[PDB]
Amino acid sequence: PRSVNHVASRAKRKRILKLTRGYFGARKNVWTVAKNTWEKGLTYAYRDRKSKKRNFRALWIQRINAAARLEGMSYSRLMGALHANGIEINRKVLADLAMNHPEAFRAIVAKVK
Amino acid sequence: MKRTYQPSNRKRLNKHGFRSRMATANGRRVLAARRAKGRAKLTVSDEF
Amino acid sequence: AHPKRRQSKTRTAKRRTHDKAVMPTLAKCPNCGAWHIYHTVCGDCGYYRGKLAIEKE
Amino acid sequence: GARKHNSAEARKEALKQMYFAKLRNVPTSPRKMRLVADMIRGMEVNRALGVLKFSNKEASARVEKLLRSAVANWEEKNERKAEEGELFVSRICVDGASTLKRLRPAPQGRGYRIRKRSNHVTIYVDT
Amino acid sequence: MRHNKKFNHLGRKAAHRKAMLSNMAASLILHKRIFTTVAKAKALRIYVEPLLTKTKEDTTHSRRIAFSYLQNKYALKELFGDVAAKIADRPGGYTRILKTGYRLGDNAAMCFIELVDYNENML
RNA sequence: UAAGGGCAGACGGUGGAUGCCUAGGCUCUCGGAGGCGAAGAAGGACGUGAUAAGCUGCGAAAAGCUGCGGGAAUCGGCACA
RNA sequence: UACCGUGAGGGAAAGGUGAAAAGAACCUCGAAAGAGGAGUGCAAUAGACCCUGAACCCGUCUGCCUACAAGCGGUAGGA
RNA sequence: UGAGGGUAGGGGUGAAAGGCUAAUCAAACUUGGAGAUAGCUCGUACUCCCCGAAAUGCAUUUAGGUGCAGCCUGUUGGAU
RNA sequence: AUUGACCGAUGGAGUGAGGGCAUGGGUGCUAAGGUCCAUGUCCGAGAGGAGAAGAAUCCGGACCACCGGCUAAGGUCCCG
RNA sequence: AUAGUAUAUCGGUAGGGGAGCAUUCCAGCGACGUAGAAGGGAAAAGGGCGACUUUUUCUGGAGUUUCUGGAAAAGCAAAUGUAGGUAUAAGUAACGAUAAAGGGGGCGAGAACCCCCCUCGCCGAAAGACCAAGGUUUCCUGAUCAACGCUAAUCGGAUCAGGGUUAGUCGGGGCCUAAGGAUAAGCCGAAUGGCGAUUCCGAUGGAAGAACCGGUUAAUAUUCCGGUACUGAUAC
RNA sequence: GUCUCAACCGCGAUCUCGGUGAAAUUGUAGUAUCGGUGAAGAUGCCGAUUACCCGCAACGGGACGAAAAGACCCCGUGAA
Ligand SMILES: [K+]
Ligand SMILES: [K+]
Ligand SMILES: [K+]
Ligand SMILES: [K+]
Ligand SMILES: [K+]
Ligand SMILES: [Mg+2]
Ligand SMILES: [Mg+2]
Ligand SMILES: [Mg+2]
Ligand SMILES: [Mg+2]
Ligand SMILES: [Mg+2]
Ligand SMILES: [Mg+2]
Ligand SMILES: [Mg+2]
Ligand SMILES: [Mg+2]
Ligand SMILES: [Mg+2]
Ligand SMILES: [Mg+2]
Ligand SMILES: [Mg+2]
Ligand SMILES: [Mg+2]
Ligand SMILES: [Mg+2]
Ligand SMILES: [Mg+2]
Ligand SMILES: [Mg+2]
Ligand SMILES: [Mg+2]
Ligand SMILES: [Mg+2]
Ligand SMILES: [Mg+2]
Ligand SMILES: [Mg+2]
Ligand SMILES: [Mg+2]
Ligand SMILES: [Mg+2]
Ligand SMILES: [Mg+2]
Ligand SMILES: [Mg+2]
Ligand SMILES: [Mg+2]
Ligand SMILES: [Mg+2]
Ligand SMILES: [Mg+2]
Ligand SMILES: [Mg+2]
Ligand SMILES: [Mg+2]
Ligand SMILES: [Mg+2]
Ligand SMILES: [Mg+2]
Ligand SMILES: [Mg+2]
Ligand SMILES: [Mg+2]
Ligand SMILES: [Mg+2]
Ligand SMILES: [Mg+2]
Ligand SMILES: [Mg+2]
Ligand SMILES: [Mg+2]
Ligand SMILES: [Mg+2]
Ligand SMILES: [Mg+2]
Ligand SMILES: [Mg+2]
Ligand SMILES: [Mg+2]
Ligand SMILES: [Mg+2]
Ligand SMILES: [Mg+2]
Ligand SMILES: [Mg+2]
Ligand SMILES: [Mg+2]
Ligand SMILES: [Mg+2]
Ligand SMILES: [Mg+2]
Ligand SMILES: [Mg+2]
Ligand code: NA
Ligand code: NA
Ligand code: NA
Ligand code: NA
Ligand SMILES: [Zn+2]
């Protein structure tokens, strides 16, 4: 018998073209251009999932540095005093406390200073 | 300029006509191949 | 001499920004009331600047 | 089984409130015709007729006679002669129709294709 | 550059251009109004007004000078007959150009030129 | 703000894919048969209709003529008016 | 077969309205092409290139963004 | 210079240029042998999982090919 | 001591254009991002981090996810 | 992967191995469909993972399918790959000899271009007239402007219909032969066949049979008509 | 007027408007500059610099611009 998968072959293309909506020019709807662009984007996402953890830790440290400096202490000396005192609060929590609850942050500083 | 096809009806039939095809064995061999193919035009004698 | 690339839709449409049909300079005829081109004889009535110019049968 | 009859009944009831006219298979290029449609879009009909009558583009004469039809369709579906200053061109669009292919000889035995294009024009009017 | 070059070549050779202006002038004298394009009618005005001015000195020399332009004896008969009497008092400005519209085949600007003393409605 | 442009959606245009379908193909099995022609063949030309380009049938007796067997209300081919 | 070749020879493209032509009388705008109606029909967005009717490509409208801005046009954040 | 004839492919014809022989000539065109052969170039399409090289030696009308060894992998039996 | 890394039989291969660096050398001019061998290593077939941006220099072998933590090479005035 | 949850391991080109999805059709047990099948648009949700699957709604208007097993025309992104369609360059090149046009009337919805008239310009050992070859209705007239015409077109060598070519002497043919061709008797030769007369065929040549001027149609004219001639047969 | 050494004139092309309307080429493009870096000569990488958005005319430095699977050179246990 003769087997041609017309409907199935065309359905594979149509599913991916829903994912390329919003692109510039021919990159959104022309099949070989769009599929090329979509595949390159997936490679970025794998790399950018890792860099997310780097960027958010760098932002926590910067906010902690500004909050500590308003209480006469740099980030490096404040962190050295916390680790010396056994405090295990992580940088995400401290940065949140630095920004939105400045009175609780001041109690952590007053415990090691 | 002068081109390759300069028509002459007397020359055409002498060279390719029905009576010249039938005069030799190889000409009749051509007529048999064209009949077996079902050609509507057998020789230049038909288009006239 | 030769295009290195086909132009995208955007580039072609940006060039065509300055492709506009020119509007006629129209005026109303004080006699007929019809539109006519300013500084020309009204083709309906035949008048021009308040005077008959082309007496039309 | 009455499904397509019920879909079509609603389609016809809506068409009673739409006033429009169509030009189909006009034997001129759609891009040049579009130049004229941009000129009269959203403009009072009495002023547009004079604008089309004295236009320097050749496509305007065809469009002028289609606007007259659109106004007449409006009066048929509303049962009164239209006033002056009342109607206006609420919508107009030009779409490319089917193309007629032809041949034009070129030097050294080559031949090129000529496209003789067509277009459709649709006009809506509104009070 | 064309600084101070005061005549329209009209897209023709010199011999062609002179022949057309002479044929057109004969048509205007015989038919009191003709329809033509605007660029051609403005060039005829500079050509035909001095010729109509020569009928104020009715002599053999004036007729022959005019004939050297038109080379048409019916135009000469009309020019020194009825046309001469109508313009005997007007100090120049014998003709008038009025614009009319555009042609179908090439969208050329159209007008009509006529002798002023033959248009009664505009007097 | 938008001369213009970008993206999304709605509704259309063009084009003729896809789904469904068949009127034609392809490979074989079983049985028969294996020629036509000087009594002019195969293949053609020209004709042939109330109307008649082209096919089909036919041959100046020219969409046809005569018998015998069958069959029973429509018929003057494709094919209309 | 059309078509190409002096000739031997080479050699295409092209299927589908509807159950039934019931294949759209008549009116309106137009010089008439084209359309809007009316009518037939289960359906006319089945109207003759007519079943369904995709893509590339092409329009109109609506929402948001855009005239101090510089790189494979996305990706991860984010008013 | 017109008309009509004649010479046909390793053949013709050539005041000789390998010129010309239907816009094709150091061997015309058409069909067939025929899907010639091409140690050469280009191309080879659904998914996930486990393992994972070589570009060395020898020989070769061999050197950008191949045979055997070396190095990978499946199954099976031994310990090494 | 060693996650087992070695061998035999038998089914299936690919490879037989290598390259950089360090060390020992020949050749060259103690030239070459040169060339020919030997011993390791990495690229080839290897992403991540530092070096402004570099196939093989320095650190380090990516099952997937995380808006958790500790470190390597290298850094801690600002772009960072 | 090993042991039966524990330990180890999970970057990969050539390449080896394992396990699956979709497609067309078949067998079996069975289901769905005008109270709406396949296909097409939109949306939502699933899968150790994935190839893919499911549901809802619009269109559509007649077929479709679960599971187990079976068989293949069983899956495209690239081959200066093929067909069909549609883009870009772009409203760009170009509209085919620089002999040339202007005006007034006309028919007409519509005129730079069509018809008539006046003027202008070009050829005139030709760009005028008559034949041959070749073409084959393009010739004249009415209707038509979709396509064709490198623009428009009321016009056309365009579409449709009707009409139009008249010979005793003209040109052929009937007669004759040239180059060459086909043969007879004969000769040669695996076959197919090759040669071969004073015979026949074959004009581009030779004929002892003979016509010229004029006029008429929208379209024929030594052909029809007028005038004036000529050449064969045949009967008295 | 070949040149020193060019100047001016006429028509056709050219430019603008109306009518008709192709082609070669084309992975996608929001396509600036300098030096560096680099398959060793960068619109697209790095660091700086400059730059409001969109056309038209005109000229050819670059896109190792297009065209044609380099004829030179070497290779094939190729061909004529
Ligand atoms: K559609
Ligand atoms: K801004
Ligand atoms: K040969
Ligand atoms: K099926
Ligand atoms: K006519
Ligand atoms: Mg422009
Ligand atoms: Mg057209
Ligand atoms: Mg106009
Ligand atoms: Mg030619
Ligand atoms: Mg659509
Ligand atoms: Mg189909
Ligand atoms: Mg009987
Ligand atoms: Mg529908
Ligand atoms: Mg349809
Ligand atoms: Mg600034
Ligand atoms: Mg030589
Ligand atoms: Mg030749
Ligand atoms: Mg040879
Ligand atoms: Mg063989
Ligand atoms: Mg082959
Ligand atoms: Mg491994
Ligand atoms: Mg080799
Ligand atoms: Mg081997
Ligand atoms: Mg080797
Ligand atoms: Mg080697
Ligand atoms: Mg080296
Ligand atoms: Mg060395
Ligand atoms: Mg080397
Ligand atoms: Mg490695
Ligand atoms: Mg690992
Ligand atoms: Mg792996
Ligand atoms: Mg297949
Ligand atoms: Mg190419
Ligand atoms: Mg250009
Ligand atoms: Mg230009
Ligand atoms: Mg040209
Ligand atoms: Mg031009
Ligand atoms: Mg011309
Ligand atoms: Mg002549
Ligand atoms: Mg005629
Ligand atoms: Mg036309
Ligand atoms: Mg005719
Ligand atoms: Mg005779
Ligand atoms: Mg004889
Ligand atoms: Mg005649
Ligand atoms: Mg006569
Ligand atoms: Mg000029
Ligand atoms: Mg133009
Ligand atoms: Mg550089
Ligand atoms: Mg650069
Ligand atoms: Mg090049
Ligand atoms: Mg090559
Ligand atoms: Na805007
Ligand atoms: Na008989
Ligand atoms: Na439904
Ligand atoms: Na496909
Ligand atoms: Zn008026």
UniProtKB/Swiss-Prot annotation, chain B:
This is Large ribosomal subunit protein bL34. Keywords: Ribonucleoprotein, Ribosomal protein. InterPro entries: Ribosomal_bL34 (IPR000271), Ribosomal_bL34_CS (IPR020939). Transmembrane segments: none annotated. GO terms for molecular function: structural constituent of ribosome. GO terms for biological process: translation. GO terms for cellular component: ribonucleoprotein complex; ribosome. The keyword Ribonucleoprotein applies. It comes from Porphyromonas gingivalis (strain ATCC 33277 / DSM 20709 / CIP 103683 / JCM 12257 / NCTC 11834 / 2561).
Swiss-Prot record, chain C:
It holds the Pfam family Ribosomal_L32p. Keywords: Ribonucleoprotein, Ribosomal protein. InterPro entries: Ribosomal_bL32, Ribosomal_bL32_bact, Ribosomal_zn-bd. GO terms for molecular function: structural constituent of ribosome. The keyword Flavoprotein does not apply. SUPFAM superfamilies: Zn-binding ribosomal proteins. One of its GO terms (cellular component) is large ribosomal subunit. Residues 1-18 have a biased composition (Basic residues). NCBIfam families: rpmF_bact (TIGR01031). Belongs to the bacterial ribosomal protein bL32 family. This is Large ribosomal subunit protein bL32. It comes from Porphyromonas gingivalis (strain ATCC 33277 / DSM 20709 / CIP 103683 / JCM 12257 / NCTC 11834 / 2561). The gene is rpmF.
Swiss-Prot record, chain D:
GO terms for molecular function: rRNA binding; structural constituent of ribosome. InterPro entries: Ribosomal_uL22, Ribosomal_uL22_bac/chlpt-type, Ribosomal_uL22_bac/org-type, Ribosomal_uL22_sf. The keyword Electron transport does not apply. SUPFAM superfamilies: Ribosomal protein L22. The keyword Cell inner membrane does not apply. One of its GO terms (cellular component) is cytosolic large ribosomal subunit. Keywords: Ribonucleoprotein, Ribosomal protein, RNA-binding, rRNA-binding. PANTHER family: CHLOROPLAST 50S RIBOSOMAL PROTEIN L22-RELATED, LARGE RIBOSOMAL SUBUNIT PROTEIN UL22M. Part of the 50S ribosomal subunit. Belongs to the universal ribosomal protein uL22 family. This protein binds specifically to 23S rRNA; its binding is stimulated by other ribosomal proteins, e.g. L4, L17, and L20. It is important during the early stages of 50S assembly. It makes multiple contacts with different domains of the 23S rRNA in the assembled 50S subunit and ribosome. The globular domain of the protein is located near the polypeptide exit tunnel on the outside of the subunit, while an extended beta-hairpin is found that lines the wall of the exit tunnel in the center of the 70S ribosome. This is Large ribosomal subunit protein uL22. The gene is rplV.
Swiss-Prot record, chain E:
The keyword Cell membrane does not apply. One of its GO terms (molecular function) is structural constituent of ribosome. Keywords: Ribonucleoprotein, Ribosomal protein. GO terms for biological process: translation. GO terms for cellular component: cytosolic large ribosomal subunit. Part of the 50S ribosomal subunit. Contacts protein L32. Belongs to the bacterial ribosomal protein bL17 family. This is Large ribosomal subunit protein bL17. The lineage of its organism: Bacteria, Pseudomonadati, Bacteroidota, Bacteroidia, Bacteroidales. The chain holds residues 1 to 123 of 160 of the full protein.
